[PDB]
DNA sequence: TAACAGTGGCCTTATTAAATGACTTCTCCATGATCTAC
RNA sequence: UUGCUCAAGAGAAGUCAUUUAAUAAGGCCACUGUUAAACGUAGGUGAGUCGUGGCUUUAUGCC
């Protein structure tokens, strides 16, 4: 319930879809008998998330991550809501939401 | 009397990666935070400058309780009991022996963190272990910053066990060794290029951070309008103000400089001459 | 409300229209039974957006991109204010908005 | 006649780590709490400023019961029996035996940072090799200006002339207790709002306010300005000095405003001299 | 088109966790012997 | 008209006077984003002010 909670939940879904896309890209990148990453890529994503300062850097990185995720239906249905949510809101809160999405993305894969 | 030497020194323009933060991942980040106008500036810790001053005191002879080994990167104490009367470093920087003559000393030098004159925008340098083989320690990133640095310090001269030890401290501030950082790839000389010193006998300073930028992405540096207003309004006695460095040219190019009260301050373009005059005044006042 | 986000939203809309037009132009460029990529087009656009180094770069880039966007109606009734928005505001903010528009573009086609 | 000197002073901008709270684990916790807008603001305790004033009095003659040794870092009492008639310290700051207990002619409130405190953590390591439990530590700083409010009951002083050294000390405050070695923060004021009135009603407490999160412009106020305009706080009893004067004189219709006829000096020393002249005239010194 | 996404070591060392003195003040009784007035 | 009928626990009182979380500390040392390439050949436009002035034949163009 509540509009803010619904927007937050479906933004979590958006971020989880983006991480699925990025992890699939990493899977396609690696070849041969080398083990593709599962967990240390999540650690890399965490390190890149905490490497953030000011509003500009984090929003740039988040937008780049979302685009690199590729196709995503949750952002498809909700353009205005997530565009406003990302453009507005403190960047630290959005980082908290992104980390919460990271910690609960894995049931998909 | 209680004589204090306050001062703000501005470094030279260059690529700097001096003080870093927690290791994080593969990228070494600078120590940065909000300074002015909500913009993020890069900082150099005052402990780094204190370590550089200690190293200067050690290199130029002198008696220092802490001896930097410089070979095994270890710190050795010549005497386990701190003696501010004998050792320069104990007299100047103080000490604190907590494990269980007084065991603690307040030190005669008080520094503040060096603040980059320019906001830190981007400036991450890619680094590779090279070769054809690759491993975890192959791709890394290092943050740098093309800016001048500016820090504020104050000396309680009367607090010194030996009043003459202020002179080596001024010499060290002038010829400062490398301030802790990645000097292998980012060699940043921390010697001053502009000085605003005040040799007064009261606690108020009003010269904390007198340097401000113009065109926020440029190397040009100017005295802040607040400092000039402070000098002109009547506060900050010009006879106690020592200004030296490359800021002297900009100060003299100002209009109505001759009629300004700032003209009555001790202004020397050559830093050595300004330091010599200031040390003459200090020796006269302290009875050295 | 607070027409700043109105300008943000119609900027996103015209950016999506322009990228749709450019993808149509690419579809015209390709020939034969080779499948015209769609995800690779988005990747190329993101890479070109990240290729810029402030002010001149990415400003003439995005103006040229919008020009090749073609007959964009929302552009036509929103020429002057979008031009003013582009002339003002930091360029990295414009890049963030463009990346968000790319991330939320698909349901058009 | 009862005479009171209320004042709110604003410090210069700089990095401050003055009042570490409790040392939570590895971090020296800068003292902070909620303030104004529900944001966390760093604080400097009033006892620190009182200690700084005591040190100022000790350093320049001014017989004081408590003598800060400065070498053994201990306090020595010249007379175990407090005598406010002879010592500046007992007369001004009071005492308590646990007698007479005084009451204290100087009342001070905690200094409050003009800006919310975001995270401002500084890392600290000890050289290299042979690393132990003390090798790694963190320290919390704050790059803002501090602002505190004080009140003096001049008539309560045993010697009326002792108010002048207190003003001199407030304007020439020594090191206010804190990490001076690493974060040297001068506590001398760059903006003052003093009120020398004769009734126990002050509306100048914490007048300075700017918010504008991370900045240092430090505009005076809107509620204090409205208080001056409305009719109370007569400008004849108001003394404003410091860098705030430049912003005040640049306001529109300032000449027609009642704030114009207040004692406004850009130079702090000139305003202090005029105020001390008025105080000496009023107190019969 | 590729391969990497940091390798280390620490995550506080002391010290003191209250010192005084007060710990309600008054009043409102119940009942029978006796005095006294009718 | 109810073991009832009537029935104020009421008046007064500052938790006070005094206290620096202080003294000390380099996130440090090392790292090439190495190696190779023919441009082959065909993708377009957004916006004012008002009655002769120095040359030149009015002409008609220059400043």
Residues of chain D positioned with their CB less than 8 A from the CB of B47: 124, 182
Of D92, D135, D114, D128, residue with least CA distance to D216: D114
Task: Give all strands (DSSP E) within chain D, no chain letters.
Answer: 4-11, 14-15, 27-28, 32-35, 39-44, 66-68, 75-77, 106-108, 111-113, 121-125, 136-140, 143-144, 146-153, 189-197, 238-242, 263-265
Region of residue D104 (left: phi > 0; alpha: psi -120 to 50; beta: else): left
Method: cryo-EM
Strands B266-268 and B241-245 turn out to be: parallel
Report angle CA D70, D140, B56 to the nearest 5 degrees.
60
Asked if D59 lies within 8 A of B2 by C-beta distance, the reply is: yes
Measured between alpha carbons, how far is D34 from D116 in angstroms, rounded to an integer?
9
Length of chain A: 109
| Residue B231 Cα to chain centre, angstroms | 23
- Whether residue A14 contacts residue A66, with contact meaning beta carbons closer than 8 Å, is answered with yes
Measured between alpha carbons, how far is B121 from B208 in angstroms, rounded to an integer?
25
- Using a threshold of 3 CB pairs under 8 A, tell whether chains C and D touch: no
The token pair at D8 is 């709110």
- Whether residue D191 contacts residue B230, with contact meaning beta carbons closer than 8 Å, is answered with no
Q: Is D130 helix (H, G, I), strand (E, B) or coil?
A: coil
Asked if D181 lies within 8 A of B233 by C-beta distance, the reply is: no
Find the Å distance, CA of residue D116 to C1' of nucleotide F25: 28
Residues in CB range of D51: below 8 A, 6 or more apart: D176, D177
Measured in degrees and rounded to the nearest 5, phi and psi for residue A4 equal -65, -40
Per DSSP, the residues of chain B read ---EEEEEEE----EE--SB----SSEEPBEEEEEETTEEEEEE-HHHHHHHHHHHHHHTS---SEEE-SSS--EEES-SS--TTT-HHHHHH-EE------SEE--SEEE--EEEEEE----EEEEE--SS---TTSEEEEE-EE--EEEEEEEEGGGSSSGGGHHHHHHHHHT----SS-TTT-------SEEEEEEESSS----TT-EEESSTTSS-EEE-HHHHHHHHHS-S-GGGEEEEETHHHHHHTSTTTTTSGGGGSEEESSHHHHHHHHHHHHHHHHT-
Strands D136-140 and D27-28 turn out to be: parallel
Measured between alpha carbons, how far is D227 from B165 in angstroms, rounded to an integer?
54
Asked if B203 lies within 8 A of D182 by C-beta distance, the reply is: no
Q: Is D231 helix (H, G, I), strand (E, B) or coil?
A: coil
The token pair at B177 is 């060794």
Distance from CA of A65 to the nearest CA of C (A): 9
Q: Which D residues between 66 and 105 have a beta carbon under 7 A from any strand F atom?
A: 73, 75, 93-96, 98, 101-104
Full 3-state SS string of D33-95: EEECCCEEEEEECHHHHHHHHHHHHHHCCCCCCEEECCCCCCEEECCCCCCCCCCHHHHHHCC
D135 touching chain B per CB within 8 A: no
The nucleotide minimizing the C1' distance to residue D127's CA is F26
Give exposure, B127-147, as e/b (b: 16+ Cβ within 10 Å).
Answer: eeeeeeeeeeeeeeebbbbeb
Of A93, A66, A65, residue with least CA distance to A8: A93
Distance from CA of A33 to the nearest CA of C (A): 26
Q: Is C1 helix (H, G, I), strand (E, B) or coil?
A: coil
Q: Which of D214, D217, D246, D247 should we substitute to test contact with B (largest number of B Cβ atoms within 10 Å)?
A: D214
Resolution in A: 2.8
Measured between alpha carbons, how far is B222 from B226 in angstroms, rounded to an integer?
11
Find tokens 């106020």 and name the residue.
D221
Measured in degrees and rounded to the nearest 5, phi and psi for residue B76 equal -115, 140
- Whether residue B42 contacts residue B116, with contact meaning beta carbons closer than 8 Å, is answered with yes
C-alpha distances out from residue A49 to A29, A52, A96, C101, Å = 22, 6, 10, 21
Residues in CB range of D175: below 8 A, 6 or more apart: B110, B203, D52, D55, D187
Strands B221-223 and B211-213 turn out to be: antiparallel
Measured between alpha carbons, how far is D13 from D76 in angstroms, rounded to an integer?
35
Length of chain B: 288
By C-alpha distance, the chain B residue nearest D143 is B35
The token pair at B280 is 């003459």
Which of the other chains make 3 or more beta carbon contacts under 8 angstroms with chain C?
A
Of D208, D273, D221, residue with least CA distance to D7: D208
Report angle CA B201, D267, B196 to the nearest 5 degrees.
50
Q: Is C39 helix (H, G, I), strand (E, B) or coil?
A: helix
């Amino acid at each position: 319930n509540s509009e803010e909670d619904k927007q937050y939940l479906i933004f979590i879904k958006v971020f989880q879809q983006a991480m699925k896309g990025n992890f699939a890209k990493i899977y396609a990148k690696t070849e041969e008998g080398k083990d593709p990453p599962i967990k240390k890529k999540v650690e890399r994503l965490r390190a890149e998330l905490n490497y953030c300062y000011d509003e500009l850097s984090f929003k740039e990185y988040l937008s780049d991550f979302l685009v690199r995720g590729g196709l995503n239906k949750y952002f498809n249905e909700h353009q205005e809501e997530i565009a406003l949510l990302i453009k507005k809101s403190p960047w630290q809160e959005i980082r908290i939401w992104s980390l919460l999405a990271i910690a609960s993305y894995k049931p998909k894969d | 009397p209680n004589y204090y030497l306050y001062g703000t020194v501005l470094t030279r323009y260059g690529l700097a990666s001096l003080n870093h933060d927690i290791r994080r991942g593969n990228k070494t980040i600078l120590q940065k935070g909000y300074w002015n106008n909500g913009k993020i500036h890069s900082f150099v810790g005052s402990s780094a400058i204190r370590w550089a001053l200690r190293f200067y005191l050690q290199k130029q002879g002198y008696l220092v309780n802490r001896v930097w080994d410089e070979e095994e990167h270890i710190n050795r104490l010549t005497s386990e009991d701190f003696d501010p009367e004998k050792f320069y470093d104990d007299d100047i920087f103080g000490f604190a022996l907590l494990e269980s003559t007084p065991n603690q000393r307040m030190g005669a030098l008080g520094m503040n963190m060096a603040v980059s004159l320019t906001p830190y925008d981007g400036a991450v340098k890619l680094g590779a272990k090279s070769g054809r083989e690759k491993d975890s320690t192959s791709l890394h990133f290092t943050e740098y910053h093309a800016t001048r640095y500016q820090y504020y310090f104050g000396i309680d001269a009367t607090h010194l066990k030996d009043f003459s030890r202020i002179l080596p401290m001024i010499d060290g501030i002038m010829n400062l060794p490398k301030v802790g950082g990645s000097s292998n790839i980012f060699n940043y000389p921390f010697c001053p290029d502009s000085l605003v010193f005040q040799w007064t006998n009261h606690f108020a300073s009003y010269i904390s951070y007198c340097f401000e930028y113009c065109d926020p992405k440029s190397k040009e540096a100017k005295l802040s309008q607040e400092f000039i207003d402070e000098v002109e309004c009547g506060q900050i006695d010009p006879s106690k103000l020592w200004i030296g460095g490359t800021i002297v040219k900009d100060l003299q190019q100002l209009d109505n400089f001759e009629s300004s009260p700032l003209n009555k301050a001790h202004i020397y373009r050559n830093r050595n001459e300004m330091i010599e005059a200031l040390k003459t005044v200090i020796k006269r006042d302290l009875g050295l």
